[PDB]
C-alpha cells in the first residue's frame, strides 16, 4: 500500500531557488529509483528529472534533484524559475511489479 | 525522433467493449519495455498496465484486475489494448508509455493521447 | 508614443539580381598597382538579393523586422529623399542595447540605448496650408530609454522632404558590419539615370565612420515617411500617401576576392575564386590576363557517406544463469564469492525482467552498461529478511551492515534483490540459516569471518562455557509461511566491478549494421577505421586470418567475420581540377580536366574531360593534355579535343 505524498501548490515565487518535497510512508523511497515528470497543461506530458541523477538531453541544467534518507523524502530544485515554468509535477516510484504516481503539484504563478 | 499515434476513442458506451491502438515508429519495437498510462481530466497521474518487449508478462493495477487485456506484436510495430465491463470512472485520456530498460528507468515517453469519455 | 496600423492589401516581396555591387575598401591602407587578395565579408556577384517596394500607387508599406546576419548590404535608389534612417537591436523590448540612426532634416545623430520601440516606428510629414513646404512633426520612433554608454552626432546633412512620383536620379548604398564589437558604415553617393535593374557599373564604397559600440545585433527595421496632404483626411487608418520610393536589402557572406588597384589607389575590378573556373584561374595566377596552356587551381576529393560497423559473431556469454538460479544459498556470515571474467557481459535479461525488488546501482549508472568494459566482475550472494534490505546500501548502519556484511563508501556496483518465500521455507519453517549478533568491534568492508567463538560482553571471563554476560553471537532465523511481508526471506545478490592494469576481459554486446558495397563508406573491422569501397575479390584466405596487406604494406583486404567473405579496400577517389584556356583576346569559356578521376563529356585516356567535344579528325595540337590527345579552339567555335597529328 505504498503512496507518495507531495503538496499541490508551491513555488509561487519570482526568480529564485525553491525546493519541492516528495515523500512516502509505507517503505523507503531510497531503495529504488524515483522520477519527476513535468506535464504541459492541456497537451503531452514530458520528463524533467530521471535516474535520481540524470535529465533528458535538451533539458536546461536549472533543474536539480537530491535524496534525503533521514526524512525519507525526495527534493526537486529549480533555480532559474524563468517564464517557461507553468506545469504540474509528479513523483513516481516502483514497489513490486507495479507503478504508483504522485498526486500532483500545480505551478502556474511564476 | 519517435512518432507515437493513438486513435482508439471518440464514443460513449456503458459497460461495453473498447479497442484502443497506439502506433509507434522510429525505433526497434522488440527490444524495450512498454506501458499504458491514463489521466482523469483535472486530476493527477496514475498507472494502468505494463508489458514486456515480447509480451510474455503483462501486469495491471488491482482496480482493473480480472478484466482488461494487453497484447503486442513486432511485425507491424503496433499495440493492442482491449477493455471490457466499463464503468463511469473510466473517463480519462490514455497515453502509450515507452520504456528504456525496465520499470526503474522511468516512463520518460508520453503520447499525445486520445480523449475517452463514457456516458 | 505610437499607433497601430490596419489590415490592407499589400504586395508580396520580389527577388532581383545584383550586378557587381557590394564592394568596399577592406582596409585603411594604400595600394598602388597591386593585385591583392583578402579574406573579408563581401556581397557575391550575381547573387539573389531581397527586394522591397515603397511606392504608394496600391498602398505598399512593407517594413518587416529582418534578421541581421554577419554583414548586410543596403542599396537605395532614392530620388525624393523618402528614406530616413535605420534601427537595430535584438529583442526590441527595452532589455538590451539597441541602435537608432535617423538622418534628420537638421542634423544626424547616432544614439544607442534601451529605447521602447513600437511595432512600426515611422516619421510623419505634414503639408502646411499657409507655408508651401513639407515639415516633419510626428516623432514616433520610441517612448523612452533607461541608460546607455555611447552617443554620436554626425555632420548636418541637408535633406529635401518633398516627395514626387518621378524617375530616380541618385543611388545610395550602405554596408553595416559588426566584428569584435566595432560598427562599420560604408557608403558612397553615385548618380544614375535608372529605375530598375541596377547597372553593371563598379563603384567601391569608402569607409564613413567607425563607432565603437560593443553590443549584440540580430534584428533591424526600416523607417519610412508618409505625407498628409489635403486629399487624405489625415488619419493613419486607411487614407495616406507616401510618394514613390524603393530600397534594396542584402546579406553579406565571407568570400575571397582579388582586388585591382590603379596608380591612384582606387579599386577598379574584383574577381572571385569560388564563382567561376575562369575566375579561379585568374585569381590563382594573381593576374587579370590568362594565356593559353594548362593550369592547376585546386583539388577534388570525395567524402564518405555512411559509417558501417560489423563486429564478429558474439556467441560468448557470462555465467549469470546459475549464479541467480541457485538452489542453495549461503548464510549472511558465510556469503559466497564468485569471480566472473573472460566473457561477454549480458545484462539485457537482468533488467528486462521484473521479478526482482531492488535494482539500485551505486557509483555507476545502469542506463549505460553495454558500452562499459570492465576487467573483473564479482558477484556475492546471501539471504536476508525484508526488513534488513536497506542496510545493504553503504552509509547505513545496523546489525547486518556492521557485523555480517559491510560495503565500502565508494561502491561502483549494483544490488539485486528479490522475494522467494515458498522456495526458501516449507510449512514447518527454515532453521538452517545463521547470523551474527555480537562482535568485538566493527567490520571492515569486504571482510568475512568464520569463527564461532563465544562472545563476552562484560569484564569477567566466563572460562569458555555458556553462562551470564557471555552468549553465542551466532543465532538462527525463524521463518513462517504466513508471516508478514517484511519478515519473508529475500535473496540479495551484489555485483562488484573493478578496474586493474590487466586488459579488460568483460564487455557488452556488439551491434552489426547491414553491409553495403561498391560505395565510398567507412568501416571499423576491429583493427582500423578505414574509409573506402568493398569490392568482391577472387582470392581465398586461409581459415585463420582476419587481416591482409599488400606489397606496399597497406591493409587492403579484410575478411567479413559474420559471412566469411573476402572484401578489398580501395580509396574512393582523389585528384585535381585542371583547366584548358584558349588564351586572352580569343575566347572566354574554359573546360575542366581531371587527371585520373573516372566519370560535353568525353572519357579520355588521361582522365575525365568535360566541356570539350571530341572529334574524330586530327590536326596539329598546341595545348598538351596527355596520352596523345590535345585540345584546341576550332570552329560557332568551341573548345575541341582530338588526337594530335605527328
Ligand atoms: C534461469 O535463468 C534463465 C535465464 O533468464 C531463465 O530462463 C528464461 O525464463 C523465462 C521465464 O518465462 C522464459 O520466458 C525465457 O524464455 C527463459 N530463457 C531461457 C534462455 O531459457 C529461467 O527462468 C531461470 N530459472 C528460474 C527458475 O527462474
Ligand atoms: C532567387 O530565388 C527565387 C526563389 O527563391 C528563384 O525563383 C530565382 O531564380 C532566384 N534567382 C536566381 C538568380 O537564382
Ligand atoms: C532630428 O531627429 C533627432 C533624432 O533623435 C533629434 O535628436 C533631433 O532633435 C531632431 N531635430 C529636430 C530639429 O528636432
Ligand atoms: C547602464 O549603463 C552601464 C554602463 O555604465 C551598463 O553596464 C548597464 O548595463 C546599463 N544598464 C542596463 C539596465 O543595461
Ligand atoms: C550578446 O549576444 C551574444 C550572442 O548571443 C553574446 O555572445 C554576448 O555575450 C551578448 N552580450 C550581452 C551583453 O548580453
Ligand atoms: C589618377 O591617376 C591618373 C594617372 O596619371 C591621372 O591622370 C589622374 O588625374 C589621377 N586622378 C586623380 C584624382 O588624382
Ligand atoms: C553468425 O551467427 C548467425 C546467428 O547468430 C549465423 O546465422 C551465421 O551463420 C554466423 N556466421 C558465421 C558462422 O560465419
Ligand atoms: C568508369 O566508370 C564506368 C561506370 O562507373 C565504367 O563503366 C568504366 O569501365 C570505368 N572506366 C574505367 C577505365 O574503369
Ligand atoms: C569519326 O569517323 C569515323 C569513321 O568511321 C566514325 O566511325 C566515328 O564514329 C566518327 N566519330 C565522330 C565523333 O563522329
Author numbering:
A (entry chain L): 1 to 110
B (entry chain H): 1 to 119
C (entry chain A): 14 to 70, 76 to 617, 641 to 676, 689 to 699
Task: List sentences from the manuscript.
Being a highly dynamic protein, SARS-CoV-2 S-protein has been observed to adopt RBD “up” and “down” conformations. Our structural study reveals that interactions between the VL6-57-encoded mAbs and RBD are mainly mediated by germline gene encoded residues in HCDR3 and LCDR1, while germline gene encoded LCDR3 residues support HCDR3 in antigen binding. We provide evidence to suggest that the identified class of antibodies constitute a potential immune pressure driving the genesis of S371L/F-S373P-S375F mutations in Omicron variants.
In binding competition assays, we found that all the 5 mAbs compete with ACE2 and with each other to bind RBD. Among CDR loops, HCDR3 dominates the contact with RBD, the hydrophobic HCDR3 loop, containing residues L101, G102, P103 and W104, probes into a hydrophobic cavity formed by RBD residues Y369, A372, F374, F377 and P384. This hydrophobic contact is further stabilized by surrounding electrostatic and polar interactions, distributed in two different patches: the larger interaction patch is mediated by hydrogen bonds between backbone of RBD residues S375, F377 and LCDR1 residue N32 sidechain; a cation-π interaction between RBD residue K378 and LCDR1 residue Y33; a charged hydrogen bond between RBD residue T385 and LCDR2 residue E51; and finally a salt bridge between RBD residue K378 and LCDR2 residue D52. Finally, RBD residue A372 is contacted by LCDR3 residue Y94.
